[PDB]
Symmetry: C4
Subunit: 415 residues, 4 copies
């Protein structure tokens, strides 16, 4: 009697505290992160926000990198803004990219990013964010180029900082971090963008850096990593801004033991890039300098590559299933799904996942977002912004099309 | 002791999980859907949003098909928008109806549809949505005309897709689906809009298509079905765009065994249409081509018909109780309730219900919404939008009137 | 053992259902309404919304009658709008007062009334609203002058209708109804505004009219009643638009047994009115025609009168404690507290209460709101709107001042 | 059996009531307030709202004193506004500071302060606010200069008033009050701003003044106190507007037994001020008249001073760790962290804390906000507003920089 009566008092007191936290929005169980990526045959459109069309009249932030990340209850678009609205003089893009005005904010997926529906996350000109099942982890880097500091928040509260260890533009994913069993993982770079730099993997629990490792990656270059969990490890597919037209990757376990390489497919994933031809398992130097944030999903030895359609500018977007492309160098693939037509503006892209705790599936669902960049330098405006579209992978019927930005430039402020 | 103590631990753990889901908004019990339609004598006004009057100044979407659907806790207006606001250059209506910019969004009933109060649902140029007691089911069709794909979401998460089986503009209700005991039901059409096409009924559980049936309906034409539950079966009243001035219907049980016919009343329900005269239990071909989304409620052999007042254009609206009109061909009715005056713009209309789990009644409450279309082609604007009004059926005193849109066109953007 | 174990299963199942309803916002316990009005010495300012100043630039409704009512968790401003925004052509006030565009909406107390923060309540050109401890009761009258219908909603769902019984502008409080022990009470009038009319008291439970009584009030005239609970009965202080410069009152118990009279004080409470002099316990006919919505609080034989400062137009506002003014005819009072200066625009005013279930007090707290009317006919604008201020009664130190509207007219739209 | 079964019924009934209150947002446990300030080495940026840049186009209040205060679930920016928006004629700053239009409002930290995201708190031209673990305490002073009244609200409900006891501009912190174990503490001043005035400490529980003490502080002057809890006592660092270029402080226990003094450091904290030189433990009269709201944190005999960089106007901002500066008069310090560059506009600043109940730390976290004042009198606009930045103290790596306002003045309304 005393055992069962004391057992009920703990269950009530515990569950009540859980219920009170869940009212404020905090979850009760961490995401396991141990399932493998879902079998899929194609991509179904998930969101489009029409941000720039709406901001022609509405009160909408000029934004960059609208990356998506999901809790176990909702999916949000995170983004960076200079704290200026479309069609206002402050959106003038002469301001440096790494400015003290730059902030990380977020809004529900598919909504135009407005001061009236957007939540403040961090002061940031480079950022990452992800949810561990319990609270949002946000990482916002600000400060001078020679001593930037990433401010780490868990549930909106500052929990750690990470300072530049090379004094040369500390910078991170610009898409979601990856969470497995209560630890979240990101990659940061410090150093040249046109030469060998330094790359670190961070393991973060409740917003505290609990472990970091510097990658030994001579002749590799890592920027703006798209990282996802897969079977309890983390895979990141990144941008080589130094001398790679194919993408670098790094994978690691929860102890930060890692492996590195480049995607071998002759279907080169970066922009700019050469025309497809025999590829390489190291960096493809032809047109390899500069780049664009991107992603890929590894399935065995095959790979789903998302990439621009143009080899030379950020135009079009397509998904390509290359069944041996992770490890083999040919430029043959078996499935292409159009996402944005060749003549249409595209831009950054990144992975995001939906965990089984949210979907009810027994596998890790892969998704991706694309940023559709409008304005300077390609168009005669004073401003630059992106809108977004996103897709999730499904094992059912899908279709290719073109879902472009659709705004008519210039705007009023440009005259 | 061990039985009652273990019985309390399951009740606590179960109810706590329920409470945590209900905090995120998810319900605990599916709608039964087995009650019969309430006895009613007339229609009481429920909402009016004044969307276009407000959007003359406010930041309000240009929208079409503002259909209502209710959970067990709230009623929402779903709608399609091109991602443009009233009084902005992007609202120019040259853009094709089936564009990649078109999205399904929703806002609380009676509020102007704004980016600041509207929730994103799906990328969609044809849509359906309904709530099963637990979560929102949304269906959003996008893609090319020759291979459109309906993306099915349950609680905002992609759960299924349905691809065009005739390659000729897959398209669905543009009003709510119907839910009974945890299964939700919709109708889709693929094929010509001016000839025989193909019509399928879908049964969907937790967002998964669990059964579908192709209707064998030679010489019938089904579009834009208004479907409601009634006594555990589903009734749909639709639009014959081929050769019917009266409306087609299809009814089915939870196993998708169905019946078909046309509303026999000589009070023809479509627009355009002939003047009332002896009707037919098959398609009335006179002025039968083209049409307008509409609805009717069957009560025994009688029918409540909502229809435009004009026989030739989308003007006025009225409710007509025809006590033998479901099965008989005369053009005599017994009650008319004015909704929108003959000289006033109207448009699409559709049914929605309020379930006993929400109302506390012992019957299924019938309601309807009307879209009040302003702008092109009837008026000299660059844009087209609808505002909405809605009514619920009551068995108490009511009154007819005219509740029209009320905006003064043209707007500023039109000059 | 079986008794205590079955007793715990009912408590858990019951409280869980309560918790799930409270998540959606519904309360668990009805307001008792049996306490007497708090002892007070003066009025402390509670809110000011600056609606019209903000709407000079912001997207703010043109509104009338911003009356306040409170649940056990929040206080809201209800208001009527034509569905037009300040500084837009649709705010042109030629439109009839009783139009099909008129709607009852509400927003948090002190916020400018905007489509982006306002909740839709009802289609209405006359309205009442109040909260019984569990859900919002709203009453919205719309329809033609000769057959208007009040639509009654409880928790946003239509529960009853009340149709005009004299075919001559059915109309009600334009401030909150009064709730006692789960029954809510309002007063409606049907008939002439310049002559004897008909007045009914309604008792409403869960949105259902359960009892009504026609008042036998020869030579009295009742409009726009301000009703509050006091010691388990209801007191209403109203507007005599026929031939009374002092205000009529009606009080009743939960069985609708009522008493009637006029406030005897020579401190006349209506506008227009004569200068103070010996008053009357019946209607004071001098300047008695026309009127303004107002209120008073009865304390024994004394009365707190809120009134304009001008005898001839809606300017200024003051609170006056007349310790024998309920029953005596002299024009001497003992305390005046300024609210709006004599040269400043005022307008409608009404009572609202805060119940002990919300305040924790052992008494009924009295409060009032004032509408500050700007624009037509007194000013050269095309529009008319009100902003609001409100005050609660306290038994601690207070101060008089002038808290006026503060907008600078005309606006841009007026030129 | 009867003991354990009755013990479970109380736990369920109690916790359920707690859960229902927590749904409305009310907390269950008061903040202890007994921990000491966290060890820190520097300041990490927490928020920036870019209010004025956004309000160039958006609908954003003209505001002053954007002070932050946190519950156990969120942090908010409180602020005063005249009820006018940026870029509208009503923002013209001729209106007196202490106007009847002035209101205390609040919005989530880092969001531009807009009518669409801001909650109304109080009518106020001087204010304080803080959260005791259970509900928000707000204090809003309005009224005439010769009889102002602070209206005290707890959980949005009026609970007390405090009237001016010297009839000479009653006025308070303009930053958060301090809460310890369910009692909240603030300081108010009544009297001259250029001479000896009167200073009172108030202890407030559930919004009721339970104790007050007049400070005996001859030759001291206290205004706009920044108060924080530290080890179960309260420390306030204030502004001497009479004859002090260093800041006054007052500390007290829960029984309002207090001590007073001035910060001795020759690193003078007020603005205007002399160049640093040997300081004083009493008021430094040189340039001591006038002032700016500010703060400091005491650590043993050392002090963290936040101050403008300019000695003569409100420009720049810096944090200075002076390890003996609380009690010693030298002008040597050991750490400076830049916050706003010398040529950039700054303004008011204040402390706020994050309690262990919110952070999970075992110490009191110190934070501060800075207001970045733009417009009149220093710039050729008709209006004056502030934006804000904030920082929290951390014991990890940080960096100095300049995070200024960034708006380009004049605005459209100024021409
Ligand atoms: C956008 O910003 C740029 C950079 O501030 C502006 O060009 C500057 O204009 C100022 C004064 O107008 C000149 O003194 C500077 O020399 C210009 N800067 C450079 C780098 O050339 C430009 O005018 C802005 N455009 C608009 C439309 O606001
Ligand atoms: C609305 O859109 C139509 C279609 O895009 C516009 O008409 C086009 O205008 C362009 C350039 O102005 C011409 O080159 C095209 O030939 C026109 N198209 C057609 C189909 O005639 C129209 O100008 C737009 N109207 C407004 C007010 O923006
Ligand atoms: C406000 O509304 C009134 C009434 O509709 C307008 O006056 C009408 O104007 C129309 C055309 O402008 C005339 O044909 C009518 O005869 C006028 N009506 C009356 C009753 O005189 C008025 O112009 C509107 N004002 C503004 C600024 O929009
Ligand atoms: C800002 O407000 C001031 C003060 O109200 C305005 O100056 C006043 O203007 C009125 C009429 O324009 C004159 O009669 C007063 O004499 C002026 N007051 C003072 C104190 O000189 C000023 O015009 C306003 N500015 C703008 C741009 O609205
Ligand atoms: C439930 O209530 C009891 C007192 O009746 C209290 O001691 C206990 O802490 C509460 N539990 C929680 C989780 O708040
Ligand atoms: C993943 O982890 C969860 C929870 O820790 C466990 O129940 C599940 O069986 C694991 N699955 C696999 C495939 O390892
Ligand atoms: C309630 O708390 C206990 C631990 O005290 C835990 O095992 C159980 O899972 C909780 N129940 C729920 C539904 O979270
Ligand atoms: C409808 O179903 C519910 C729940 O399954 C049941 O309790 C109820 O009696 C049914 N009513 C009818 C009329 O079949
Ligand atoms: C609690 O859970 C049990 C099943 O474990 C269920 O029968 C019961 O209805 C639930 N109670 C409520 C109020 O939902
Ligand atoms: C009022 O009613 C409540 C609840 O019904 C009761 O507890 C209370 O004692 C009553 N008070 C008076 C003064 O009648
Ligand atoms: C829980 O429910 C019981 C009745 O089943 C009721 O008496 C009790 O007051 C409820 N508890 C709370 C905290 O509402
Ligand atoms: C502070 O108070 C809390 C709660 O009253 C107590 O548990 C804790 O031990 C106290 N800490 C110190 C340092 O006094
Ligand atoms: Ca590259
Ligand atoms: Ca290949
Ligand atoms: Ca037809
Ligand atoms: Ca008939
Ligand atoms: Ca009168
Ligand atoms: Ca008297
Ligand atoms: Ca000073
Ligand atoms: Ca020193």
């Amino acid at each position: 009697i005393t055992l069962r009566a004391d057992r009920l008092e703990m269950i009530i007191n515990d569950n009540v505290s859980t219920i009170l936290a869940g009212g404020s929005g905090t979850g009760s169980v961490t995401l396991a992160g141990n399932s493998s990526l879902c079998p899929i045959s194609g991509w179904a459109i998930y969101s489009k926000d029409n941000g720039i069309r709406i901001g022609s009249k509405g009160d909408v932030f000029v934004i960059r990198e609208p990356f998506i990340s999901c809790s176990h209850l909702e999916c949000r678009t995170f983004f960076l803004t200079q704290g200026a609205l479309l069609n206002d003089k402050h959106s003038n893009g002469t301001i440096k990219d790494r400015s003290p005005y730059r902030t990380l904010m977020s809004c529900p997926v598919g909504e135009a990013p407005s001061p009236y529906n957007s939540r403040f996350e961090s002061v940031a000109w480079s950022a990452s964010a992800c949810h561990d099942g319990i609270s949002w982890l946000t990482i916002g880097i600000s400060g001078p180029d020679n001593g930037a500091v990433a401010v780490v928040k868990y549930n909106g509260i500052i929990t750690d900082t990470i300072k530049s260890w090379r004094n040369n533009i500390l910078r991170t994913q610009e898409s979601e971090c990856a969470c497995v069993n209560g630890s979240c993982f990101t990659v940061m770079t410090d150093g040249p963008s046109n030469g060998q730099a330094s790359y670190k993997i961070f393991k973060i629990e409740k917003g505290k850096v609990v472990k970091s490792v510097e990658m030994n990656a001579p002749n590799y270059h890592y920027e703006e990593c798209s990282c996802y969990p897969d079977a309890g490890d983390i895979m990141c597919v990144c941008r080589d801004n130094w001398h790679g037209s194919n993408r670098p990757w790094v994978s690691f376990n929860q102890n930060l033991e890692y492996q590195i390489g480049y995607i071998c497919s002759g279907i080169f994933g970066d922009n700019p890039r050469p025309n497809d031809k025999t590829g390489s398992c190291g960096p493809v130097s032809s047109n390899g300098a500069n780049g664009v944030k991107g992603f890929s999903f590894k399935y065995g030895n095959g790979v789903w590559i998302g990439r621009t359609k143009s080899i030379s500018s950020r135009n079009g977007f397509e998904m390509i299933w290359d069944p041996n492309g992770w490890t083999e160098t040919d430029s043959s693939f078996s499935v292409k799904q159009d996402i944005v037509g060749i003549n249409e503006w595209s831009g950054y892209s990144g992975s995001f996942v939906q965990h089984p705790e949210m979907t009810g599936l027994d596998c890790m669902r892969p998704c991706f977002w694309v940023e559709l960049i409008r304005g300077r330098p390609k168009e005669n405006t004073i401003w630059t912004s992106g809108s977004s579209i996103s897709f999730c992978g499904v094992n059912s019927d899908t279709v290719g099309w073109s879902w472009p930005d659709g705004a008519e430039l210039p705007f009023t402020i440009d005259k």
